[PDB]
Design a protein around this ligand. Structure first.
Ligand SMILES: [Ca+2]
Length: 123
């Protein structure tokens, strides 16, 4: 869910408030997304959106009424490393991996303040 995703990002970027820093960034970081990613961070978000769409296609996820945003899963942050739990059932395990991948992606690319709250006229 959103609360676990927030924590994974802070796990990799301890100085951030991910729900403030990465929401509404580019054409893809935030709800929805279309167009050509504006930079590599925006591309991390595009990949993440695709991952969520893929999760949605899984039989296992289609059984739950809960979408990725509210679907809770278990993970730990230790020494700034993220570990998705073996106790997650298939859907939750898939979503946890989508989240883990984006958090690490976010921690490896430049952050461009001029892409924050981007006019979706660029998308
Ligand atoms: Ca998005």
């Amino acid at each position: 869910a959103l609360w676990q995703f927030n924590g994974m990002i802070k796990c990799k970027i301890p100085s951030s408030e991910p729900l403030l820093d990465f929401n509404n960034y580019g054409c893809y970081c935030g709800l929805g997304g279309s167009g050509t990613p504006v930079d590599d961070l925006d591309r991390c978000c595009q990949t993440h959106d695709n991952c969520y769409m893929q999760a949605m296609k899984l039989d296992s996820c289609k059984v739950l009424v809960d979408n990725p945003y509210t679907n809770n899963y278990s993970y730990s942050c230790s020494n700034n490393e993220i570990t998705c739990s073996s106790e997650n059932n298939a859907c939750e395990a898939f979503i946890c991996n989508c989240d883990r991948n984006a958090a690490i992606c976010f921690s490896k690319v430049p952050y461009n303040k001029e892409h924050k709250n981007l006019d979706k006229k660029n998308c």
